[PDB]
DNA sequence: CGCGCATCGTCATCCTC
DNA sequence: GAGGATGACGATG
DNA sequence: CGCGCATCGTCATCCTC
DNA sequence: GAGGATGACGATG
């Protein structure tokens, strides 16, 4: 029971897997971002990647997988999943509150949630299911910019110290009919995201403009 | 036979002593290639196939379950490849395979590594190159499965147990060996083929700005880096070796962070500035407790200072026995007389059989040209009369066969090479350049008769050290392009400190 | 005869498959179980055991 | 016709025995011609007349290369009048 | 490697009424 | 200075 | 795939004395 | 006879 006493009023230090940031929770929660990756692998790519920009406005917590479903669903498999529970421990949320004025949001211990996930259909999955998540309780929160994305290239191309990166099949797909000298550049499919190194990670969260 | 019953001591002074064997086999690097039989399964795998592109770790992992008969589980030999691969700061001072991907930072103890199916690898440029091809012959391989297998160990140009360390637990018996420098092992072998006397070392690592002081032999302590910002701040540059950023946060910020049991709440802030190689910590505290920490020592207060010892240097012999090495510069110099001893193995093996390559090469040529003089009539005669006119001649059997039998010595004539050549081989375009190859075959082969084998290994090193530096290079380069340029560069006045007592055993 | 972990590492090395060899493996085994219920017919010989 | 002594290949240049070749009435690799068939939706091709070693020029292999020509015109008969 | 929990559409029961 | 306790590590269950 | 717990010999600290 | 509840299965997180 003391243990559990001194649990509460630190942070959310239940779970060891969380890298907390340093704003988060105090002063300027407004702006303190929390970025979700799916798996364990992108973590490492995430913290790797952290190492430019900083340790304030951003963390990163890693989920597991299929993430239930909640519009049709008992309410005890609600509070049998724990992974949930950790998310809205985190976040801050709470089922039957309103979130309608800026104050409300600003009670929250975080400003805005970023969502990256492999460039594939699954990760594409995980996203609809946690947009259905936020919305099948929140619907307020949708019209204030909480959610984003953050997207990474699925192959490159190479020759001679050039570099060309692509998002989507369709636009590889034009590249080559609309290009001559095709071939000549080395290939390379990406299929995980921890398939990139140190230096695409630097790249990757120098252009926060395009991600 | 039958047996009805067992005794206890037939029963372990016959059976568990096979296990305790296979496990001090299994467990233990060798003095030779410094390298294990997992490894050595994983880089003969590796040497097969000539893999110019990259390759994914799980394809390979099941090539070499497929051709090095390794029959203790896939999963125990993903994390050996990956081992075989991690460059960070502490893990390895040379790498044998390059890391592409995540291979896992310093930060989550080298575990936090992707899936791997993520991850993909290709062999490195230094690992051709300290493995020279001309070698395989000289050692001995096995038969496992009736399939040609990796052989029992590998003959570098280097030691590799004095570069990558060699840290096991067996039975009986353990290993503890720390990593040092290649610069200077190349010095010292340099140095030591002349005749010299061999230098005394210090275990160093690559990437590591720490202090390591000697105090007693094969004894040695290591400080990290902390320096005092103001007069109220401090700032921690690096931890030592054998130190993990999680776990070293999770082990004294926490504590200190809070009051424990007994002890008031020292530190006041903490906050991390944490990049891929380096770590920078900003702790804010009271400037009494500085002070105190001053009287006392940084380096006790913050657990810089680390002691290492070496006394459990327990390798295996050229022969197979167990030895227990006091001094590095005695495996160093065993190393030598171990490599000396093979450059009379390579010279006779690579002459004699590049002789017979050009004598190969001559009897076709002798073929071709008695062929268009006309003299060898071919058409519509028996396979026996053509064999039967050709030994005549003074035509022998394939060298290569030759040697082949006279190495395996440890169905009559033979002449299909001299028929197996087509039509296109009956031309002076072809002839011109089959003249100028035995030509050249010639050449190298008076070349080599000319040399003498020990020099070749001082060409080697300069090869090797012009390669490196191309590499080095690279590493230097990829630290550059991540450089950011604009950010927090906090400097300050260094302590340095050492333990006052010796405290020698 | 083969190994069903070297074959699973051929597969993804020609196949192109990119799913995970763990997905794999479990639909090898299905393509070779014999048991009454699980197929009529089977396309890989059962060595060993693949379940009962 | 190498048997018959018309066709002299020695120290002769590939360009010419092409050339010599050709007016015979020699064709290239009709594989290559299925191959480029499917295809569909460097010069001559004569590598396979002469990729052939010297054991094909005694008569032991001759007589095996004839009755193999041979079951490979039965096999298409066959073909050609099956359903 | 074993159990850990998730999607997604039909449906055979399974527990009330 | 003098003794017991314990986890640290790596190939495998 | 992540955490789950085990051997086995040396030893650097770590908690009493 | 008439309605809601739920796990069963297989390739993948
Ligand atoms: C834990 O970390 C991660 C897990 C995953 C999932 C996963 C998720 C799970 C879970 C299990 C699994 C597991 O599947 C299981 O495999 C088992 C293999 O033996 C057979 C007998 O039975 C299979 C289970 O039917 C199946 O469920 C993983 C296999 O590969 C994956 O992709 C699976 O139980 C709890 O949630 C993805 C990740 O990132 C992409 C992770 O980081």
């Known amino acids: ?211 | 036979q039958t047996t009805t019953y067992l005794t206890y001591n037939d029963f372990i002074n016959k059976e568990l002593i096979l296990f305790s064997n296979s496990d001090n086999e299994r467990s233990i690097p060798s003095m030779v290639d410094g390298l294990k039989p997992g490894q050595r399964k994983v880089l003969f795998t590796c040497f097969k196939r000539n893999d110019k592109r990259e390759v994914k770790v799980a394809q390979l992992a099941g090539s070499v379950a497929e051709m090095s008969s390794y029959h203790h589980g896939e999963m125990s030999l993903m994390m050996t490849i990956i081992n075989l691969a991690q460059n960070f700061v502490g893990s390895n001072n040379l790498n044998l395979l390059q890391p592409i991907g995540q291979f896992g930072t310093r930060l989550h103890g080298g575990k936090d590594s992707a899936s791997p199916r993520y991850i993909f690898t290709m062999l490195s440029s230094l690992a051709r190159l300290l493995f020279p091809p001309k070698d395989d012959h000289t050692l001995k391989f096995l038969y496992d499965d009736n399939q040609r297998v990796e052989p029992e160990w590998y003959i570098p140009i280097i030691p590799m147990v004095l570069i990558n360390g060699a840290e096991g637990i067996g039975t009986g018996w353990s290993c503890k060996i720390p990593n040092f420098d290649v610069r200077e092992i190349v010095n010292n072998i340099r140095r030591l083929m002349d005749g010299e006397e061999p230098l005394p070392m210090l275990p160093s690592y690559k990437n590591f700005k720490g202090t390591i002081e000697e105090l007693a032999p094969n004894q040695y302590v290591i400080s990290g880096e902390v320096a005092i910002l103001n007069s109220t701040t401090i700032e921690i540059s690096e931890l030592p070796v054998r130190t993990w950023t999680q776990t070293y946060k999770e082990q004294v910020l926490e504590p200190m962070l809070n009051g424990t049991e007994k002890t008031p709440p020292l530190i006041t802030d903490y906050r991390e500035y944490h990049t891929d190689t380096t770590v920078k910590f900003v702790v804010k505290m009271t400037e009494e407790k500085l002070a105190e920490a001053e009287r006392v020592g940084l380096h006790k207060v913050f657990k810089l200072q680390t002691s290492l010892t070496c006394n459990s240097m327990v390798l295996f012999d050229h022969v197979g026995c167990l030895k227990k090495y006091d001094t590095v510069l005695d495996i160093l110099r065993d190393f030598f007389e171990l490599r000396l001893k093979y450059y009379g193995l390579r010279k006779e093996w690579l002459l004699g059989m590049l002789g017979a390559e050009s004598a190969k090469l001559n009897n076709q040529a002798r073929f071709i040209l008695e062929k268009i003089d006309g003299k060898i009539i071919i058409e519509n005669k028996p396979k026996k009369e053509l064999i039967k006119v050709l030994i005549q001649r003074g035509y022998d059997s394939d060298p290569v066969k030759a040697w082949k039998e006279a190495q395996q010595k440890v169905s009559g004539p033979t002449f299909n090479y001299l028929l197996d050549m087509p039509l296109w081989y009956l031309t002076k375009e072809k002839k011109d350049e089959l003249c100028r190859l035995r030509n050249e075959k010639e050449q190298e082969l008076d070349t080599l008769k000319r040399k003498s084998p020990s020099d070749l290994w001082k060409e080697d090193l300069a090869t090797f050290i012009e390669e490196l530096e191309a590499v080095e290079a690279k590493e230097k380069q990829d630290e550059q392009v991540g450089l950011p340029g604009k950010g927090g560069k906090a400097k300050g006045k260094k302590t340095q400190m050492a333990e006052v007592l010796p405290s020698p055993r």
């Open chain 1, 1 to 211: 029971n003391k243990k559990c006493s001194a649990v509460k009023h630190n942070r959310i230090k239940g779970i060891p897997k969380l890298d907390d940031a340093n704003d988060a929770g105090g002063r300027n929660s407004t702006e303190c971002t929390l970025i979700l990756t799916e798996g364990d692998s992108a973590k490492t790519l995430a913290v790797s990647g952290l190492g430019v920009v900083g340790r304030d406005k951003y963390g990163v917590f890693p989920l597991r997988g299929k993430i239930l479903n909640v519009r049709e669903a008992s309410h005890k498999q609600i509070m049998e999943n724990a992974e949930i529970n950790n998310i809205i421990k985190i976040v801050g949320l709470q089922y039957k509150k309103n979130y309608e004025d800026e104050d409300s949001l600003k009670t929250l211990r975080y400003g805005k949630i970023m969502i990256m996930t492999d460039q594939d259909q699954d990760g594409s999955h995980i996203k609809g299911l946690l947009i259905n998540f936020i919305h099948h309780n929140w619907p307020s929160l949708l019209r204030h910019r909480f959610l984003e994305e953050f997207i990474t290239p699925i192959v490159k191309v190479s020759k001679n110290k050039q570099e060309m990166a692509f998002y989507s099949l369709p636009e590889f797909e034009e590249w080559k009919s609309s290009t001559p000298n095709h071939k000549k550049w080395k290939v390379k499919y990406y299929k995980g995201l921890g398939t990139s190194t140190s230096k695409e990670a630097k790249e990757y969260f120098a252009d926060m403009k395009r991600h």
